[PDB]
Homo-oligomer: A and B are copies of this chain.
Amino acid sequence: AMGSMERASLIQKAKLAEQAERYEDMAAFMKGAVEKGEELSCEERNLLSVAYKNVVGGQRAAWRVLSSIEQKSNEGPEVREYREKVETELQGVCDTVLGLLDSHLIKEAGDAESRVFYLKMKGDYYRYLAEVATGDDKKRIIDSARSAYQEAMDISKKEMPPTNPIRLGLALNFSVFHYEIANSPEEAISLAKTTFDEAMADLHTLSEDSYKDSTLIMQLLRDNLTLWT
């Protein structure tokens, strides 16, 4: 759909769409940029991720409202039909993101920073599919999330310092996966604690600005540990 627009113009418009809080537009501009076939810079990867996280975040919040109403009603067909409509739209967005990662962002990502970023995205979007999945391929979807997060973890632990914000955010989100999706709260708590402690011990190496970036995510790990223990 964006084939006739220059890559640089799509990137510029994605930044404008963010400022205007037009996240569907932002995601469409960034999909167009990915489909130009060139690798993405750090900033461009963040624009892609921000766009889709906002789009799918609104869909997830709506699905949760509707699922709650539907569960109360089961204690006409309209609530189920509308929850299904939102669910299908959410699944379509997750499939779109996963398709960009598979064609061909991951295979072209050779540096640890880009490969970990994309594999964390892959884990996240399979996790969002798992949130709405029921039984049939719930297990296979959960395993796809776990596999993507695990590969990202393995690379991050070999190639990045323990304070790296992407490594920290990956560990945070994988811990949420364990707690909320995989029914493994002890694994979630262990991962969050080990991640926090190893980051704390590496803060001394950081500049003031890097310190602020890392400690912000550490506080999120602490916030979950406080809720889980």
List residues of A whose CB falls within 8 A of some B CB.
9, 12-13, 16-17, 19-22, 58, 61-62, 65-66, 69, 76, 78-79, 81-82, 86
Residues of B within 8 A of A17 (CB): 82
Q: Contact at A21–B62, with CB atoms within 8 Å?
A: yes
Apart from A12-B76, A19-B66, list 7 A-B contacts with CB within 8 A. A12-B78, A13-B81, A16-B69, A20-B66, A21-B58, A21-B61, A22-B62
Q: Contact at A13–B61, with CB atoms within 8 Å?
A: no
11 A-B contacts (beta carbon < 8 Å): A12-B76, A16-B66, A16-B69, A16-B78, A16-B79, A17-B82, A19-B66, A20-B62, A20-B66, A21-B62, A21-B65
A26 → chain B closest CB, angstroms: 11
Residues of B within 8 A of A12 (CB): 76, 78
In whole angstroms, what is the CA distance A91 to B78 when docked? 31
A7 → chain B closest CB, angstroms: 12
Q: Contact at A65–B13, with CB atoms within 8 Å?
A: no
A51 → chain B closest CB, angstroms: 14
Q: Contact at B62–A9, with CB atoms within 8 Å?
A: no
Residues of B within 8 A of A13 (CB): 78, 81-82
Q: Given that A12-B76, A78-B12 are known contacts, is A69 also in contact with B19, CB under 8 Å in the complex? A: yes
